[PDB]
Design a binder for this molecule. Structure first.
Ligand SMILES: *[C@@H]1O[C@H](CO)[C@@H](O)[C@H](O)[C@H]1NC(C)=O
Lengths: 638, 140
């Protein structure tokens, strides 16, 4: 008997195009199609009504696009979607909500002084990162929270850029000021950026004191090595002498170490001083070396110029003393694994202070051959093949840096559960993808792999795949399969429409051995490089044959998308470096977009319905196969 | 405004005056203690006389600029609660700024604070309830 299927995003948005996927399986001829959406409580009115015809030429594959008007006729608002498949009818109730947009606030500097001017821009975008003309309110608040400046702007005809400037008086509250921006329509969402006012300070020259490592290891005989760097305000280096003294810190009491006072020559502008382990151990007159764990050290340095008598001071407080510096976590692993097929992990190793680690080997326990090296972002990607039974899989990861002992290495344990077969039929689908970062213009080969008994293999002739991006449904299609083949490769092009990580959901349906219907599905999450759809590059138009000289004219060249609006600002680079806490970068923008995805589970679910719901999809068929209704606007906490 | 000379003096200057008032208000918040009281100098003992003067000036500018009602209401409440004696006299603890049996000293301070409160009579009447009682006691 023919089976008719309907697929649509889990959450529908007002005033935005929404794609509905319609299918007929084992249906001859062509079938007319009419899809309508009504109010859930009573089906009083029609919000939209579209029609199409599914032809056997396209394998009964159809996609109908509709827009839900912002009528606001009724009130978690639901709408029922009813599709008439010839005589047959399939109905599914889907949640509805609206999103407003995003605001990005750019400030030239994060530390000002009383008297200077604050320059900030507001960028207005929608869910697709496109300029939009709305009305936005901008406020500036002092540390006490009293709005000192209030503005009401409209970005219409401004191409989504709003410039603003504020003049700091000579006598202002000193602390951490904030800027609040929100659309007038939806004041529930406020975007904030903060800066500091501070007080006028200007030393003779800059000195930076930092250790090579980010912590101290007790059993490290090399000691703690610190690199003192000095350079003038105009760029040239400093040659002089630096007096450095270390000191333990037991919570809030500084038991300064007298024997560790050293005098070092700063040549070329950089020095180096080592604290011996013996000195530190004898300073606290404690025979136990482990007793110093948790007692952070600090370094005080005093640089004295060789020409005159200029003196500046630097400090670096909070160098932890740790015996297990690295802590290990899982980030984007699925939780359900198809038994007997490879399982992909992902691991994140962080320093004691919470920063990502770098070149820390990781390895699963007991396999020893699945090693890797932690990358710049702290992510290490591994793969482990799974057992053929259906007992849960326990996987343990450990860092294997050589300096520490086995008992001091990080360790994290996770348990995964098998994918639930519909009728213990041992029918599975597997999607294998490259576990790296792609770029637009590259081509991705997805290997559809199928396992089942050699008695119903010939009854499957195709796979259907759907691509989810930014919550919306990107594209669908078919993968015709010649009978007898287990592995089928889909060559998939990657364009700028895939710039944030997309998701691929594939499935096949067949009649069961007993006589019922069967739907088997799998999904994968694929991450591609985060970059703008267009391009923007600033370089020097003039011939590069001279270092720039003060007061002279310089020519700049900006290359970008035609008709775009480019905005510039120049900063000292002394305040840019300390702005590492938060900068306006494309990665941050795409992360902000990625925080509003419909589905949150990485790549699998317990059942086929779990797979379809986790990816942010719904699937209803004329038979008794459907996915559970979702009512919450945010999935449970991780 | 109450004489309506802007048409010949120039309506374009009104916004400038408003900006000036806004800047002045932005500066004055530097002296606001966390206890909703204004001090003569930064981070020092709050002064009743200065708090009353600030309340009087703020109550005249709500109709011009967007004066925060929380600040003014908190200052009025602080004056009424923490500085008013049952007899009807406003106490002063910070060092004196103006010229002050203690007669002719409390009278001038009470008169000044009363003049200040009469400006914020219809402004913080909802956030501060016992204001009319304080005004009546001070007048008596
Ligand atoms: C929707 O159908 C149109 C027909 O022109 C096609 O271009 C588009 O790719 C289809 N989208 C999906 C998601 O199938």
């Amino acid at each position: 008997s023919p089976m008719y299927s309907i697929i649509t995003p889990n959450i529908l948005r007002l005033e935005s195009e929404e794609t509905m996927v319609l299918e007929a399986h084992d249906a001859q001829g062509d079938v007319p199609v009419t899809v309508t959406v009504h109010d859930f409580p009573g089906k009083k009115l029609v919000l939209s009504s579209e029609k199409t015809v599914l032809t056997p030429a396209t394998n009964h594959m159809g996609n109908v696009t509709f827009t839900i008007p912002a009528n606001r006729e009724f009130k978690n608002k639901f709408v029922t979607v009813q599709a008439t498949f010839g005589t047959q009818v399939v109905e599914k109730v889907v949640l509805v909500s609206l999103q407003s947009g995003y605001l990005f606030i750019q400030t030239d500097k994060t530390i000002y002084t009383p008297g200077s001017t604050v320059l900030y821009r507001i960028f207005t975008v929608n869910h697709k990162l496109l300029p939009v003309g709305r009305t936005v309110m901008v406020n500036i608040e002092n540390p006490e929270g009293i709005p000192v400046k209030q503005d009401s702007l409209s970005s219409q005809n401004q191409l989504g850029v709003l410039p603003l400037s504020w003049d700091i008086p000579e006598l202002v509250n000193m602390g951490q000021w904030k800027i609040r921006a929100y659309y007038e329509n939806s004041p529930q969402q406020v975007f904030s950026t903060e800066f500091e006012v501070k007080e006028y300070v200007l030393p003779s020259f800059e000195v930076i004191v930092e250790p090579t490592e980010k912590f101290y290891y007790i059993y490290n005989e090399k000691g703690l090595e610190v690199t003192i760097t000095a350079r003038f305000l105009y760029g040239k280096k400093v040659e002089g002498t630096a007096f450095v003294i270390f000191g333990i810190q037991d919570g809030e009491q500084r038991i300064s170490l007298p024997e560790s006072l050293k005098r070092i020559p700063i040549e070329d502008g950089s020095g180096e001083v080592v604290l011996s382990r013996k000195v530190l151990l004898d300073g606290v007159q404690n025979l136990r070396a482990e007793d110093l764990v948790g007692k952070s050290l600090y370094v005080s340095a005093t640089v004295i110029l060789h020409s005159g008598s200029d003196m500046v001071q630097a400090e670096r407080s909070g160098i932890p003393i740790v015996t297990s510096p690295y802590q290990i976590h899982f980030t984007k692993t699925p939780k359900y694994f198809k038994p007997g097929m490879p399982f992909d992990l992902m691991v994140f190793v962080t320093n004691p202070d919470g920063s990502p680690a770098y070149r820390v080997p990781v390895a699963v326990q007991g396999e020893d051959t699945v090693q890797s090296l932690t990358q710049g972002d702290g992510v290490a990607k591994l793969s482990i093949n799974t057992h053929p039974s259906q007992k849960p899989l326990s996987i343990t990861v450990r860092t294997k840096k050589q300096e520490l002992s086995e008992a001091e290495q990080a360790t994290r344990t996770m348990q995964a559960l098998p994918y639930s077969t519909v009728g213990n039929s041992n029918n599975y689908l597997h999607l294998s993808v490259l576990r790296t970062e792609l770029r637009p213009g590259e081509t991705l080969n997805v290997n559809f792999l199928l396992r089942m008994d050699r008695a119903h293999e010939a009854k499957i002739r195709y796979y259907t795949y759907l691509i989810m991006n930014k919550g919306r449904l990107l594209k669908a299609g078919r993968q015709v399969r010649e009978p007898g083949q287990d592995l089928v490769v889909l060559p998939l092009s990657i364009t700028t429409d895939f710039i944030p990580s997309f998701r691929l959901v594939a499935y096949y349906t067949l009649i069961g051995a007993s006589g019922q219907r069967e739907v088997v599905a799998d999904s994968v999450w694929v991450d591609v490089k985060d970059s703008c759809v267009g391009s923007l590059v600033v370089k020097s138009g003039q011939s590069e044959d001279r270092q720039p000289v003060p007061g002279q004219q310089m020519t700049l060249k900006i290359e970008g998308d035609h008709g775009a609006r480019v905005v510039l600002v120049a900063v000292d680079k002394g305040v840019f470096v300390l702005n590492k806490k938060n900068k306006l970068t494309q990665s941050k923008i795409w992360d902000v977009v990625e925080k509003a995805d419909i589905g949150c589970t990485p790549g699998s679910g317990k059942d086929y319905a779990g797979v379809f719901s986790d990816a942010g999809l719904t699937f209803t068929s004329s038979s008794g196969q459907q996915t559970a209704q979702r009512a919450e606007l945010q999935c449970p906490q991780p | 405004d109450e004489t309506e000379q802007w048409e010949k003096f120039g309506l374009e200057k009104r916004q400038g005056a408003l900006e000036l008032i806004k800047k002045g208000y932005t500066q004055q918040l530097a002296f606001r203690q966390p206890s909703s009281a204004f001090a003569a100098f930064v981070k020092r003992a709050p002064s009743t006389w200065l708090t009353a003067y600030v309340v009087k000036v703020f109550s005249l500018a709500v109709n011009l600029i967007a004066i925060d009602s929380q600040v003014l209401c908190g200052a009025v409440k602080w004056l009424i609660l923490e500085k008013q004696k049952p007899d009807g006299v406003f106490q002063e603890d910070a060092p004196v700024i103006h010229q002050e049996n203690n007669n002719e000293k409390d009278m001038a301070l009470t008169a000044f604070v009363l003049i200040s409160l009469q400006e914020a009579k219809d402004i913080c009447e909802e956030q501060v309830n016992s204001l009319p009682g304080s005004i009546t006691k001070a007048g008596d």
